[PDB]
Amino acid sequence: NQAAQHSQKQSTELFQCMYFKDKDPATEERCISDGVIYSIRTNGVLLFIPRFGIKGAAYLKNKDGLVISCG
RNA sequence: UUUUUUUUUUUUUUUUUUUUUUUUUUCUCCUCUUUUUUUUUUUU
């Protein structure tokens, strides 16, 4: 049963990964999401998507230390 | 008015046999980063 569990989890992750496949995310209106947080880490705060349901740790600090501002 | 003679197609057939796919090289080798590892639950 635990193996089955892992199967559903990584199968669905892969199915979502192809939702974000090659078909150009530049002109099809399937690009912008929203975001809340739930936990702080030392390079990027953990993000969440209420409209799809995906998680993942992002980064504010980038490789060249070129940290973000906004206009 | 122009007779007579000068051989031709090698002889032979009534011999035994108890093996067996292939076949014969090439060295040691830096796997990058949010984690502990999540977990009940219900609709197949």
Q: What is the residue-wise DSSP string for chain A?
A: -HHHHHHHHHHHHHHHHHHTSSS-TTTSS------EEEE--SS--EEE-TTT--EEE--SS-TT-------
Q: What gap in Å lies between CA A55 and CA A62, rounded to an integer?
A: 19
Nucleotide nearest to A1 (CA to C1'): B39
The DSSP bridge pattern shows strands A55-57 and A46-48 to be: antiparallel
Q: How was this structure determined?
A: cryo-EM
To what resolution in angstroms was this structure determined?
7.0
Nucleotide nearest to A57 (CA to C1'): B34
Cβ-7 Å neighbors of strand B? A 2, 5-6, 9, 41, 43-44, 46, 56-57
* Protein-contacted bases of chain B (C-beta within 7 A): 34, 38-40
Q: Is the CB of residue A61 less than 8 Å from the CB of residue A43?
A: yes
Cβ neighbours of residue A60 closer than 8 Å, sequence gap 6 or more: A43, A44, A45, A67, A68
